[PDB]
Design a protein around this motif. Structure first.
Motif, PDB file in Angstrom:
ATOM      1  N   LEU A  48       0.662  -1.088   0.035  1.00 46.54           N
ATOM      2  CA  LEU A  48       0.002   0.020  -0.015  1.00 46.54           C
ATOM      3  C   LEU A  48       0.776   1.434   0.175  1.00 46.54           C
ATOM      4  CD1 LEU A  48      -2.885   1.139  -0.125  1.00 46.54           C
ATOM      5  CD2 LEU A  48      -2.902   1.318   2.426  1.00 46.54           C
ATOM      6  N   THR A  49       1.851   1.481   1.021  1.00 43.59           N
ATOM      7  CA  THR A  49       2.833   2.489   1.058  1.00 43.59           C
ATOM      8  C   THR A  49       3.567   2.729  -0.345  1.00 43.59           C
ATOM      9  OG1 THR A  49       4.309   1.209   2.028  1.00 43.59           O
ATOM     10  CG2 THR A  49       2.664   2.402   3.493  1.00 43.59           C
ATOM     11  N   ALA A  94       2.461   1.930  -3.109  1.00 44.42           N
ATOM     12  CA  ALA A  94       1.613   2.532  -4.026  1.00 44.42           C
ATOM     13  C   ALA A  94       1.090   3.949  -3.954  1.00 44.42           C
ATOM     14  CB  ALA A  94       0.136   1.392  -4.053  1.00 44.42           C
ATOM     15  N   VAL A  95       1.091   4.389  -2.644  1.00 46.01           N
ATOM     16  CA  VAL A  95       0.528   5.728  -2.219  1.00 46.01           C
ATOM     17  C   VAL A  95       1.921   6.721  -2.677  1.00 46.01           C
ATOM     18  CG1 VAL A  95       0.271   7.483  -0.538  1.00 46.01           C
ATOM     19  CG2 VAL A  95      -1.349   5.368  -0.797  1.00 46.01           C
ATOM     20  N   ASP A  96       3.225   6.083  -2.338  1.00 48.65           N
ATOM     21  CA  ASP A  96       4.386   6.899  -2.814  1.00 48.65           C
ATOM     22  C   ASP A  96       4.131   7.128  -4.173  1.00 48.65           C
ATOM     23  OD1 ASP A  96       6.851   7.904  -2.907  1.00 48.65           O
ATOM     24  OD2 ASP A  96       7.692   6.463  -3.355  1.00 48.65           O
ATOM     25  N   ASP A  97       3.874   5.999  -5.022  1.00 44.61           N
ATOM     26  CA  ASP A  97       3.618   6.358  -6.481  1.00 44.61           C
ATOM     27  C   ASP A  97       2.792   7.149  -7.027  1.00 44.61           C
ATOM     28  OD1 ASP A  97       5.562   4.231  -6.996  1.00 44.61           O
ATOM     29  OD2 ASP A  97       4.214   2.831  -7.250  1.00 44.61           O
ATOM     30  N   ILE A  98       1.441   7.462  -6.426  1.00 43.19           N
ATOM     31  CA  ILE A  98       0.486   8.521  -6.935  1.00 43.19           C
ATOM     32  C   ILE A  98       0.730   9.998  -6.090  1.00 43.19           C
ATOM     33  CG2 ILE A  98      -1.186   7.088  -7.771  1.00 43.19           C
ATOM     34  CD1 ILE A  98      -2.701   7.869  -4.869  1.00 43.19           C
ATOM     35  N   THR A  99       1.879  10.106  -5.402  1.00 40.04           N
ATOM     36  CA  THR A  99       2.011  11.160  -4.876  1.00 40.04           C
ATOM     37  C   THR A  99       3.537  12.046  -5.054  1.00 40.04           C
ATOM     38  OG1 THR A  99       2.880  10.554  -2.738  1.00 40.04           O
ATOM     39  CG2 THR A  99       0.605  10.770  -2.835  1.00 40.04           C
ATOM     40  N   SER A 100       4.134  11.121  -5.720  1.00 41.81           N
ATOM     41  CA  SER A 100       5.630  11.574  -6.236  1.00 41.81           C
ATOM     42  C   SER A 100       6.177  10.745  -7.278  1.00 41.81           C
ATOM     43  CB  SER A 100       6.549  11.618  -5.094  1.00 41.81           C
ATOM     44  OG  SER A 100       7.867  12.193  -5.295  1.00 41.81           O
ATOM     45  N   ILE A 101       6.597  11.368  -8.399  1.00 35.79           N
ATOM     46  CA  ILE A 101       7.304  10.592  -9.510  1.00 35.79           C
ATOM     47  C   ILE A 101       8.503  10.213  -9.563  1.00 35.79           C
ATOM     48  CG2 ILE A 101       5.339  11.412 -11.138  1.00 35.79           C
ATOM     49  CD1 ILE A 101       7.255  13.460 -12.484  1.00 35.79           C
ATOM     50  N   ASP A 102       9.113  10.738  -8.330  1.00 35.58           N
ATOM     51  CA  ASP A 102      10.594  10.841  -8.418  1.00 35.58           C
ATOM     52  C   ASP A 102      11.106   9.567  -8.360  1.00 35.58           C
ATOM     53  OD1 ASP A 102      10.243  13.688  -7.637  1.00 35.58           O
ATOM     54  OD2 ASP A 102      11.816  13.666  -6.040  1.00 35.58           O
ATOM     55  N   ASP A 103      10.501   8.492  -7.755  1.00 36.56           N
ATOM     56  CA  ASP A 103      10.730   7.271  -7.736  1.00 36.56           C
ATOM     57  C   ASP A 103      10.740   6.516  -9.124  1.00 36.56           C
ATOM     58  OD1 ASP A 103      11.788   5.189  -5.549  1.00 36.56           O
ATOM     59  OD2 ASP A 103      10.345   3.769  -7.043  1.00 36.56           O
ATOM     60  N   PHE A 104       9.773   6.674  -9.774  1.00 38.76           N
ATOM     61  CA  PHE A 104       9.665   6.414 -11.172  1.00 38.76           C
ATOM     62  C   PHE A 104      10.795   6.824 -11.986  1.00 38.76           C
ATOM     63  CE2 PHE A 104       7.753   8.339 -15.376  1.00 38.76           C
ATOM     64  CZ  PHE A 104       7.689   7.000 -15.659  1.00 38.76           C
ATOM     65  N   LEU A 105      10.896   8.224 -11.857  1.00 41.28           N
ATOM     66  CA  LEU A 105      12.158   8.709 -12.795  1.00 41.28           C
ATOM     67  C   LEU A 105      13.285   8.171 -12.502  1.00 41.28           C
ATOM     68  CD1 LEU A 105      11.151  12.653 -12.836  1.00 41.28           C
ATOM     69  CD2 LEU A 105      10.767  10.790 -14.582  1.00 41.28           C
ATOM     70  N   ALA A 106      13.544   7.976 -11.166  1.00 37.52           N
ATOM     71  CA  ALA A 106      14.872   7.224 -11.069  1.00 37.52           C
ATOM     72  C   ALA A 106      15.068   5.653 -11.496  1.00 37.52           C
ATOM     73  CB  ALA A 106      15.160   7.112  -9.433  1.00 37.52           C
ATOM     74  N   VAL A 107      13.902   5.070 -11.321  1.00 40.57           N
ATOM     75  CA  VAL A 107      13.854   4.025 -11.999  1.00 40.57           C
ATOM     76  C   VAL A 107      13.964   4.066 -13.509  1.00 40.57           C
ATOM     77  CG1 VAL A 107      12.070   2.049 -12.612  1.00 40.57           C
ATOM     78  CG2 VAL A 107      12.745   2.255 -10.272  1.00 40.57           C
ATOM     79  N   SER A 108      13.366   4.789 -14.146  1.00 40.68           N
ATOM     80  CA  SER A 108      13.016   4.979 -15.526  1.00 40.68           C
ATOM     81  C   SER A 108      14.474   5.337 -15.959  1.00 40.68           C
ATOM     82  CB  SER A 108      12.356   6.071 -15.857  1.00 40.68           C
ATOM     83  OG  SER A 108      10.797   5.836 -15.927  1.00 40.68           O
ATOM     84  N   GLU A 109      15.302   6.123 -15.263  1.00 44.74           N
ATOM     85  CA  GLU A 109      16.669   6.448 -15.692  1.00 44.74           C
ATOM     86  C   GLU A 109      17.584   5.043 -15.395  1.00 44.74           C
ATOM     87  OE1 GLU A 109      18.999   9.609 -13.392  1.00 44.74           O
ATOM     88  OE2 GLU A 109      20.529   8.218 -13.504  1.00 44.74           O
ATOM     89  N   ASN A 110      17.758   4.237 -14.402  1.00 48.46           N
ATOM     90  CA  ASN A 110      18.046   3.020 -14.384  1.00 48.46           C
ATOM     91  C   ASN A 110      17.807   2.253 -15.636  1.00 48.46           C
ATOM     92  OD1 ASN A 110      19.445   3.327 -11.655  1.00 48.46           O
ATOM     93  ND2 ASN A 110      17.602   2.700 -10.706  1.00 48.46           N
TER      94      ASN A 110
END
Ligand SMILES: [Ca+2]
Ligand SMILES: [Cl-]
Length: 255
Positions: free
Chosen positions: A122-123, A125-141
């Motif tokens: 859950l957490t 999932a909530v991190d994903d809809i409140t910040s794209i920072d993780d998404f971008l760091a993963v996308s970059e990797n």
């Protein structure tokens, strides 16, 4: 901008005092182990109230998310936590009445582990809809890795790998532009928004198109017979530019 304020406020899912359910659970379990029914019941209320707070924070985050797919995972994950909660409480109450019952110990443990895993899902999932920072760091990797596979494919004259790696790069790059563009509609004009958007346009209108043409030319040449010569340097240059472009979108979004 207010919703953007609510978002950050909701970022209190990062172990919030009143949203914290793991500690209340360890305490409830210990009272159960020491066979104290009254203590369990007391701590069960605290555990349930924080889980309810956690759920409330997740639903709220969902109400200010245009991420229809992120929101579904959150809601699904929330509803499973909701169903799981009273079952954890009953495994504790059961153990509280029969603390030496090995079955009650084993069941408590399986419910405890199940709660921890469900609270993590859950957490995140909530991190994903409140910040794209993780998404971008993963996308970059992933872009770096895929760009590297694309160039190795070039060196190994692997036309299949070239087309396949380039397809993964283009699709991930396109998704990064989409996730950043929309996210930018939560802010107002300034040197921030503009820099994020110029970085994104340079990627989609200039970088991606020239990387695509170099891939095309490499495949055309390698599919010759014998292979028709080519400039590996322009290819290497263009693929690196994909990484530079995505990395710049990320830097921009962060500031
Ligand atoms: Ca995550
Ligand atoms: Cl996302």
């Amino acid at each position: 901008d207010l919703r953007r304020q609510l978002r950050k406020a909701v970022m209190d899912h990062v172990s919030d005092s009143f949203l914290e359910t793991n500690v209340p659970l360890l305490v409830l379990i210990e009272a159960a182990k020491n066979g104290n029914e009254k203590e369990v019941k007391e701590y069960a209320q605290v555990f349930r109230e924080h889980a309810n707070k956690l759920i409330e924070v997740a639903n709220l985050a969902c109400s200010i998310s245009n991420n229809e797919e992120g929101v579904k995972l959150v809601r699904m994950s929330a509803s499973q936590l909701e169903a799981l909660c009273p079952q954890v409480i009953n495994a504790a109450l059961a153990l509280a009445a029969k603390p030496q019952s090995k079955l009650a110990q084993e069941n408590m443990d399986l419910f405890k582990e199940q709660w921890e895993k469900q609270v993590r899902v859950l957490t995140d999932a909530v991190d994903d809809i409140t910040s794209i920072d993780d998404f971008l760091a993963v996308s970059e990797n992933h872009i770096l890795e895929d760009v590297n596979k694309c160039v190795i494919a070039l060196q190994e004259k692997d036309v299949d790998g070239l087309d396949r790696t380039a397809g993964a790069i283009r699709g991930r790059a396109a998704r990064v532009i989409h996730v950043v563009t929309s996210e930018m509609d939560n802010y107002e004009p300034g040197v921030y928004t503009e820099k994020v958007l110029e970085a994104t346009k340079l990627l989609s209108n200039t970088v991606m198109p020239r990387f695509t043409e170099q891939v095309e030319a490499a495949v055309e040449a390698l599919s010759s017979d014998p292979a028709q010569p080519m400039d590996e340097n322009e290819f290497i240059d263009a693929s690196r530019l994909v990484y530079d472009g995505i990395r710049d979108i990320r830097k921009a979004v962060l500031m």
